[PDB]
Amino acid sequence: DFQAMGRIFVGLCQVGAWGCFDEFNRLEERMLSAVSQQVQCIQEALREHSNPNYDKTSAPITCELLNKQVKVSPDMAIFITMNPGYAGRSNLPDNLK
Amino acid sequence: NPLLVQDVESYDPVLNPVLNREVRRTGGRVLITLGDQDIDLSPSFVIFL
Amino acid sequence: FNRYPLIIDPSGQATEFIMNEYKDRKITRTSFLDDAFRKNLESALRFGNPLLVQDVESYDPVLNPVLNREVRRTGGRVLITLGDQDIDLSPSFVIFLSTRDPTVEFPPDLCSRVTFVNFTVTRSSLQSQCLNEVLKAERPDVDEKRSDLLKLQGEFQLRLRQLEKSLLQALNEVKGRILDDDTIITTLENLKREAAEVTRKVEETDIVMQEVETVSQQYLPLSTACSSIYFTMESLKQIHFLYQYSLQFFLDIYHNVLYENPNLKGVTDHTQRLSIITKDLFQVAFNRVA
Amino acid sequence: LDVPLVLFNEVLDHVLRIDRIFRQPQGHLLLIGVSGAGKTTLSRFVAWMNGLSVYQIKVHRKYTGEDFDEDLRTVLRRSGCKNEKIAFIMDESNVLDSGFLERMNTLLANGEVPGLFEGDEYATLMTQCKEGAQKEGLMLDSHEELYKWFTSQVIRNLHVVFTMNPSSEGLKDRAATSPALFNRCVLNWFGDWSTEALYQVGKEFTSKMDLEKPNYIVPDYMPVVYDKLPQPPSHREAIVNSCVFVHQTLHQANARLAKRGGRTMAITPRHYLDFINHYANLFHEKRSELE
Amino acid sequence: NGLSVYQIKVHRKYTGEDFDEDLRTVLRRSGCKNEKIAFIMDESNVLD
Amino acid sequence: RDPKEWIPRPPEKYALSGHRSPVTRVIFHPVFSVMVSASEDATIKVWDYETGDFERTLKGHTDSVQDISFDHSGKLLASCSADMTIKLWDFQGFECIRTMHGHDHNVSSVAIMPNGDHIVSASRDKTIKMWEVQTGYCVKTFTGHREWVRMVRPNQDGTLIASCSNDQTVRVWVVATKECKAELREHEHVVECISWAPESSYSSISEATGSETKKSGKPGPFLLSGSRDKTIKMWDVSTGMCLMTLVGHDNWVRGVLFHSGGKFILSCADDKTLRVWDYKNKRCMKTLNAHEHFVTSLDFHKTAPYVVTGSVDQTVKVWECR
Amino acid sequence: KEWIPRPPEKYALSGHRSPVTRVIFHPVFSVMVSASEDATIKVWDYETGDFERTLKGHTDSVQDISFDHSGKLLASCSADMTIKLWDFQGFECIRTMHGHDHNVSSVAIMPNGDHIVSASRDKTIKMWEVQTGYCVKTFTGHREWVRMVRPNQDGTLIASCSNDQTVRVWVVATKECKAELREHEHVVECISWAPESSYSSISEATGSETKKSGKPGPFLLSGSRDKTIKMWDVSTGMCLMTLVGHDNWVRGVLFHSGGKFILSCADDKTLRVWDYKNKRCMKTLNAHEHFVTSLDFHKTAPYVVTGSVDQTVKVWECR
Amino acid sequence: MSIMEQPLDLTHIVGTEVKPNTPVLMCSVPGYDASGHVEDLAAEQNTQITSIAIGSAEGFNQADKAINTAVKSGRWVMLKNVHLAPGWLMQLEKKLHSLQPHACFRLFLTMEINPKVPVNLLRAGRIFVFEPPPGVKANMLRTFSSIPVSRICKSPNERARLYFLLAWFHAIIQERLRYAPLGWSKKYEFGESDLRSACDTVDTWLDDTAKGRQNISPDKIPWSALKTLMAQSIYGGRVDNEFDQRLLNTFLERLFTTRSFDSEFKLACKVDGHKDIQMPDGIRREEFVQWVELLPDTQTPSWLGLPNNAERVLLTTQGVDMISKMLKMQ
Numbered sequence A: 001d002f003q004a005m006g007r008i009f010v011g012l013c014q015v016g017a018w019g020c021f022d023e024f025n026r027l028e029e030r031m032l033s034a035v036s037q038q039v040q041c042i043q044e045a046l047r048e049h050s051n052p053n054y055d056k057t058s059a060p061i062t063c064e065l066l067n068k069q070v071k072v073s074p075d076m077a078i079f080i081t082m083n084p085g086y087a088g089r090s091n092l093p094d095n096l097k
Numbered sequence B: 001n002p003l004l005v006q007d008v009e010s011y012d013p014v015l016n017p018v019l020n021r022e023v024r025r026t027g028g029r030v031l032i033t034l035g036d037q038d039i040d041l042s043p044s045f046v047i048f049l
Numbered sequence C: 001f002n003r004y005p006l007i008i009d010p011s012g013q014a015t016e017f018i019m020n021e022y023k024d025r026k027i028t029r030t031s032f033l034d035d036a037f038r039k040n041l042e043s044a045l046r047f048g049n050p051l052l053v054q055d056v057e058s059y060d061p062v063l064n065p066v067l068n069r070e071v072r073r074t075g076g077r078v079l080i081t082l083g084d085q086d087i088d089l090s091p092s093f094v095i096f097l098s099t100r101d102p103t104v105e106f107p108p109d110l111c112s113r114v115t116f117v118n119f120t121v122t123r124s125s126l127q128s129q130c131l132n133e134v135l136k137a138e139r140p141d142v143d144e145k146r147s148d149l150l151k152l153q154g155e156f157q158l159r160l161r162q163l164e165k166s167l168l169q170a171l172n173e174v175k176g177r178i179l180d181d182d183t184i185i186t187t188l189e190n191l192k193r194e195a196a197e198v199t200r201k202v203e204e205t206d207i208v209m210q211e212v213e214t215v216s217q218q219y220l221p222l223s224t225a226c227s228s229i230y231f232t233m234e235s236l237k238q239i240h241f242l243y244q245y246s247l248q249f250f251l252d253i254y255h256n257v258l259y260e261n262p263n264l265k266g267v268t269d270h271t272q273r274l275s276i277i278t279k280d281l282f283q284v285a286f287n288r289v290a
Numbered sequence D: 001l002d003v004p005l006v007l008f009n010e011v012l013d014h015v016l017r018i019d020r021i022f023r024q025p026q027g028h029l030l031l032i033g034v035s036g037a038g039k040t041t042l043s044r045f046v047a048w049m050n051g052l053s054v055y056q057i058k059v060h061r062k063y064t065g066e067d068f069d070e071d072l073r074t075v076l077r078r079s080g081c082k083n084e085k086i087a088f089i090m091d092e093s094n095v096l097d098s099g100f101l102e103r104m105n106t107l108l109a110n111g112e113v114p115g116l117f118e119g120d121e122y123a124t125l126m127t128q129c130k131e132g133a134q135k136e137g138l139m140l141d142s143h144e145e146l147y148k149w150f151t152s153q154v155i156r157n158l159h160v161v162f163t164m165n166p167s168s169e170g171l172k173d174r175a176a177t178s179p180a181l182f183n184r185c186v187l188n189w190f191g192d193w194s195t196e197a198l199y200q201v202g203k204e205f206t207s208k209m210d211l212e213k214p215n216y217i218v219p220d221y222m223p224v225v226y227d228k229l230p231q232p233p234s235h236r237e238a239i240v241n242s243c244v245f246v247h248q249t250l251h252q253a254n255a256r257l258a259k260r261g262g263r264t265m266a267i268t269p270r271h272y273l274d275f276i277n278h279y280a281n282l283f284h285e286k287r288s289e290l291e
Numbered sequence E: 001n002g003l004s005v006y007q008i009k010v011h012r013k014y015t016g017e018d019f020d021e022d023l024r025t026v027l028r029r030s031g032c033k034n035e036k037i038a039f040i041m042d043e044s045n046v047l048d
Numbered sequence F: 001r002d003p004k005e006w007i008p009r010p011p012e013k014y015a016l017s018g019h020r021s022p023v024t025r026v027i028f029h030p031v032f033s034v035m036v037s038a039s040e041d042a043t044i045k046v047w048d049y050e051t052g053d054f055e056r057t058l059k060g061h062t063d064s065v066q067d068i069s070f071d072h073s074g075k076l077l078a079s080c081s082a083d084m085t086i087k088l089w090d091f092q093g094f095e096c097i098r099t100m101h102g103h104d105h106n107v108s109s110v111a112i113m114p115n116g117d118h119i120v121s122a123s124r125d126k127t128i129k130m131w132e133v134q135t136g137y138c139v140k141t142f143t144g145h146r147e148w149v150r151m152v153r154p155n156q157d158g159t160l161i162a163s164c165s166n167d168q169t170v171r172v173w174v175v176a177t178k179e180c181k182a183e184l185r186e187h188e189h190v191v192e193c194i195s196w197a198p199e200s201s202y203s204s205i206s207e208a209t210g211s212e213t214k215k216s217g218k219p220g221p222f223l224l225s226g227s228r229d230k231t232i233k234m235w236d237v238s239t240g241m242c243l244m245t246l247v248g249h250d251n252w253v254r255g256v257l258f259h260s261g262g263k264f265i266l267s268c269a270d271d272k273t274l275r276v277w278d279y280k281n282k283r284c285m286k287t288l289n290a291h292e293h294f295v296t297s298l299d300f301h302k303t304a305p306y307v308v309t310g311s312v313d314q315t316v317k318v319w320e321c322r
Numbered sequence G: 001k002e003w004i005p006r007p008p009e010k011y012a013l014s015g016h017r018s019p020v021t022r023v024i025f026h027p028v029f030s031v032m033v034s035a036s037e038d039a040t041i042k043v044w045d046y047e048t049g050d051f052e053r054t055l056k057g058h059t060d061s062v063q064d065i066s067f068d069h070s071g072k073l074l075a076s077c078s079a080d081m082t083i084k085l086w087d088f089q090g091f092e093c094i095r096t097m098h099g100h101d102h103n104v105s106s107v108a109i110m111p112n113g114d115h116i117v118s119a120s121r122d123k124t125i126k127m128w129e130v131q132t133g134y135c136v137k138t139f140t141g142h143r144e145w146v147r148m149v150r151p152n153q154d155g156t157l158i159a160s161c162s163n164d165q166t167v168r169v170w171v172v173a174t175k176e177c178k179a180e181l182r183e184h185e186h187v188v189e190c191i192s193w194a195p196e197s198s199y200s201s202i203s204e205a206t207g208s209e210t211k212k213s214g215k216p217g218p219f220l221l222s223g224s225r226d227k228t229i230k231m232w233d234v235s236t237g238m239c240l241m242t243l244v245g246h247d248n249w250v251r252g253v254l255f256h257s258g259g260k261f262i263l264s265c266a267d268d269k270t271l272r273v274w275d276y277k278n279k280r281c282m283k284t285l286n287a288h289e290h291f292v293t294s295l296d297f298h299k300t301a302p303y304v305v306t307g308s309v310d311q312t313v314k315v316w317e318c319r
Numbered sequence H: 001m002s003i004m005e006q007p008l009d010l011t012h013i014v015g016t017e018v019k020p021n022t023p024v025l026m027c028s029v030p031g032y033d034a035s036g037h038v039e040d041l042a043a044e045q046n047t048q049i050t051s052i053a054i055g056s057a058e059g060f061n062q063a064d065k066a067i068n069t070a071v072k073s074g075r076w077v078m079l080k081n082v083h084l085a086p087g088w089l090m091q092l093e094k095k096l097h098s099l100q101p102h103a104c105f106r107l108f109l110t111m112e113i114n115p116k117v118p119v120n121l122l123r124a125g126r127i128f129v130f131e132p133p134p135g136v137k138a139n140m141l142r143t144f145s146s147i148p149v150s151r152i153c154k155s156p157n158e159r160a161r162l163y164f165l166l167a168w169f170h171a172i173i174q175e176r177l178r179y180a181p182l183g184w185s186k187k188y189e190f191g192e193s194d195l196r197s198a199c200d201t202v203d204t205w206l207d208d209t210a211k212g213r214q215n216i217s218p219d220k221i222p223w224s225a226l227k228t229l230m231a232q233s234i235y236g237g238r239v240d241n242e243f244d245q246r247l248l249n250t251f252l253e254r255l256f257t258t259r260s261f262d263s264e265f266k267l268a269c270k271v272d273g274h275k276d277i278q279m280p281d282g283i284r285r286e287e288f289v290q291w292v293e294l295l296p297d298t299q300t301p302s303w304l305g306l307p308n309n310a311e312r313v314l315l316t317t318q319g320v321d322m323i324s325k326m327l328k329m330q
Ligand SMILES: Nc1ncnc2c1ncn2[C@@H]1O[C@H](COP(=O)(O)OP(=O)(O)O)[C@@H](O)[C@H]1O
Pocket: C068, C069, D003, D004, D005, D006, D007, D011, D034, D035, D036, D037, D038, D039, D040, D041, D042, D163, D270, D273
């Protein structure tokens, strides 16, 4: 659900570990859209972390996850593995794709 | 509904709230606590024994 | 109505009409979505207050005894079993149900319990609305002249009905013969002379209506075109479920082409302005719809 | 119930059918017909005659499965422990979930729901069955045989009336979702009011109005709608025949409207009652003002 | 004083079992719910 | 005048008296320099505390008005009366724009959410109801109290609403999920009034009670509950423990609130006195003989140094602070 | 304050079936009380103009009514030869007071809140006790019907006007007419005194010289049927200015709460607002279609109430 | 009908033609999203916007708070994929009807064209349909309008030509999707996401090669880097067929070469059998845009390299459907 995906993302963001979500389309269609908001916030934090003007001596880069400020490690990444050929699997929303 | 009750020699001790008129105002005008039910008294009600 | 009415009006104009009619009777507006609907229902039933309930698509089955008039008469009072408590049903109580979705479906039991009243837009009514709208925008003097005359004719016709009723009223209440009491003759002379100028006032008002009508004949084709465009708009739902358009959408297009038309900046000729409005009306409608 | 009812031949036949089942043990009704045809009112009238207590669940928007179970618990306690003749009238619109039918399916056939009473309520039910069995003079102590007496009492006491509209697909769906509804229930097809029934209601209701025209001319081609209309009809009979034709006109109107693809609202006998009621009031009002 | 007034509603059918249930009710409220109860009763309520 | 330390003084500034019935509550306008008071004569009179001049009366209620409140912007006034109705007032126009029904008995409290889009109320039917400002629809009901609920008050962010009832318990609810966060019961008698701790007082409360600083950084919401056992108790909503008990009132405490600077506690009772409390040392400095009868309520202005106290003697008084 | 009635009205209350005789303002509450000739005392809420209740204890036409300093008790006089005391909390007659023969004209309560005065056709003024109801002392010296009587602001000095063209000022302790004024052309009807807010305004508006103590002395005003309003000095007894311009008999006179202007009513069917400082404001306002009977000025609120013969009571905004 | 082929002007319609009470329903065919346009619209309007993804219970809570806050503060609210909760949408429409929001308040409901969308919501709001542009000329105009002018006009003067070539390649590839068996092997999801990645790829490698120089040699442009990345990662990622990859490779090598800078370079050969599309000689953004606006109205599948008869059956079918639609609504 949304809470578990956010909680997993919080663990990945803080640790800085790669998250491989195989069979990502097995989630509900409504909940895939809900997850997309968290991914966009995470990706936006990563993009803002990569600009040259950022300095490690300043405040660490954080993203809004589960109504909390969670530090985002630059080494973390999100990977989803899917098989679209199976009938009945949810279709990922366009904003998520 | 004026009421006449006969055979008072077998008085039921349930008219005591009615006889003592221990009603309260506000929250529905006159309110009488008949047993466990918060009955709403009617101003035209009267009882004869 | 025998059964309590159910009102269908997407534009909602029937809602305030029910309000205005029962405003003196302290009518109360509620909805089925309100958690406190039961309390308002009991208050209306006990005190006999008119009630208007919106969002009938969420109909509460608690009205089933009320709509079915499953009343109990005992001791001189009328008892209705609303839920599990008995409420003295005042005879003045009346309930109205309203909705804004013309396409909402109802279970057959609900259909049997209410009298459906559908407020649909007709071609004649739409043509009149558009004709009045363009008249106000282009000829405000004529529009206000027409508005005043309609008020004049209404209270002229009402006055004549009162005079006609009073004349029969006086002649039916004479205790004897007319000439026996002179005051009777005074009343009839006053009543008969009163209708003399009102009839002339009606006549002088009617001729101005002829001039008002004959200047609005130029804008008649535009109103006819507006009815055709809007009914084409409504029928667009036959080819695709997404082409849902309300009356307010067409009115906004009509309003935009009338007041916010950039091509009417320096044009003063009435015929030229009407042609420009007609040409841009089709263009604006296509641009917004497509 | 202070509501007027117009009695015709079909009503007398129907109430007799309802009375027959109510006098039988484990008697359950399956009344099928258009809404507003009197299925609930007739059952309530017959239930009063036989001493049955009419119970209907007060369903609302927030009604849930637990609310349904609580109502079932109350009905069974009164029917079994208190030995009260109960006619449980329920409409298909009260079925807001498949679990509602599941409880009913077991109750209709077995007469008891194994999972309805548990914990404290089971103890309370078991206690209530103790002095309950005392009043008939039965000395039963252990829980198991107490439940059998409670189950037997419910079977003898509780009667269920189920009313629903005649939906062809809904009938087939309900034939599998509730098998006990088609095996433990007597199916009565009330249907819509027939042409004779409509004529009888119009004839009785419009009897108060004059509707008399001695110089009425019978046309050569009478638009006969009621088959048993007298061959030389009177002015009143012609009026009632017209009233029947008006009601049947709406039925064809919906069929044509539905066939084209529009939205149609079902025509019910309550519409006919409004029609004659408006006819009675308008005739009285227009006659009064004209005089 | 915040005491909750409790009065037994006696009647013609009031027997010993009814009184015991009322005693059970007041004791549960005043012993388990920590509710202060001022138990007021009259000699007329003493049928047995 | 220390800008966070002023306290009222015995010499009263103004003695406004126009009410025909005991004054129920008195509140300050958040923006304008105007005063609103509700009494038992079904009238809500509006006064100006700078000049002490009566301005107008807001009538429309059938029976006694029990509580009034303002939204954040000060443009809406929410009043609840004993006639089972809640009325919303357009303050600029001074007209009743919406009447809310649904309570089954006397309504004894009302408050507008900090967001300003919802209204919370408590009544004698043992329920706490929530209403929509725009539509006037009841959207939530908070059940669980076993007796008449006297007051309901929300916290600063509006996520938590506290309630005190005749069941001698104080309950804290979660608006989002309707659950009872805690059941604070230590008063030996009916609890009358409740009040939250302002943001400026968490540090002072934490250091006064000796509570250690938390790793999260938020000491947790603090609640005050004045009751009729002549005691004032401060609670920790997070932990459910009574931090302290204030003693010194001679009768039932009717109102309690914090100083705007979060340095003192202002409380009024039926002992005809208004008392200022030092929760630093758990003792009272100054006692003011406010009125000649019971004191029903008090309010403390956010910025200006003015204190208003209502009373049963049908008199509303304004106190200068020095 | 420059509160001035305006030609537009706010409410025209008409509930009396008989001509209204006097109207007063409640000292604290938002209550306006009107007394009429149908032996009924009606209570109105001037803010919203809603009839509240009636006090029908009197027998004959009610003449004059008065409150106390606290607004707790209402004293009434009528033509039934009696004085009635009303408890304003419950609105009942708590003490009916007899004597003082024939139609009683005026009644007032001194700011002491313990004694009541009254005037009648019997050419005398009686002083009573509110607590007991026994007339301890009686004022004699008027040779005709005493019309209207008012006390001072501290319950020591009382002025009474009568048909005998004399306005006599009495003293509580000595019971003697300290100042007798017999100079009016026609019958004096209404009198009123001066609040402390206006003593300073009189000194330079009339050129009066301060005495050794420096205090200008108590001030008097009398209205008479001779269409002239004359204000008088209680300490000395001479005129300072005469106000002329009323078309008919004057019936009620009082000072503005700010003590700067003069407001009066007369049988000229109009209310006249006059300025004595510079004779600048001579505003004449049509009030009623019939004779105007009495008027009152609210102490703080910008409202004025007028009673007339036309069974109608009107309230005007002050601007 | 000349207005429709022009790119949609959201700035004018939202600011003027849309009332605050009316939600802005922005429907889109699968493969297209309207969320990106509003964020760009909000950014250029300097107006704060709250974006909430519908589909979670807490997502509904944030939607209620954001709408409640915005109607008083005059902000903007976005709710994406609202079609996933048709039941909640009916409740949302009822709340919107009884509402008096701020004059600057705007509500955007981003959803795909689904039959489950409530009818009342469609009537309540204004509907905007997002779909593939009708023609190659329209596809260019949308591409150029979306890309900021400052982004194209950077230090290298050859950047404008590269963007135009990418726009033509994007226009050709996307347009071929209307011919499912002939243009490709299946309906690939060639959308704006691929175009944005390609634009970023062009900027990254052009800046890497040209170190801020005003002009660069046509051969010095990393043609291999752009050709390989587009054929393997940007556009070739969605391709799962060997022959489709071969077709994509053919277009890339036919376009992204040093010969593309020649004055006589040909975009297409023998579109009508005699005339052929010619490379514009401009070196700035404006010149390329003017050439796009000067493209002939007539368009044939030969523009895409497909045979001219590929659209005969499709046009005939659409003509019959148009007649049926007219005959269904008389
Ligand atoms: N025989 C009848 N004569 C007159 N009215 C009837 C008759 N039968 C039913 N009705 C009307 O139908 C209403 C009750 O309908 P009901 O029996 O609840 O419908 P259903 O049969 O679908 O449950 C009553 O108000 C009554 O006026």
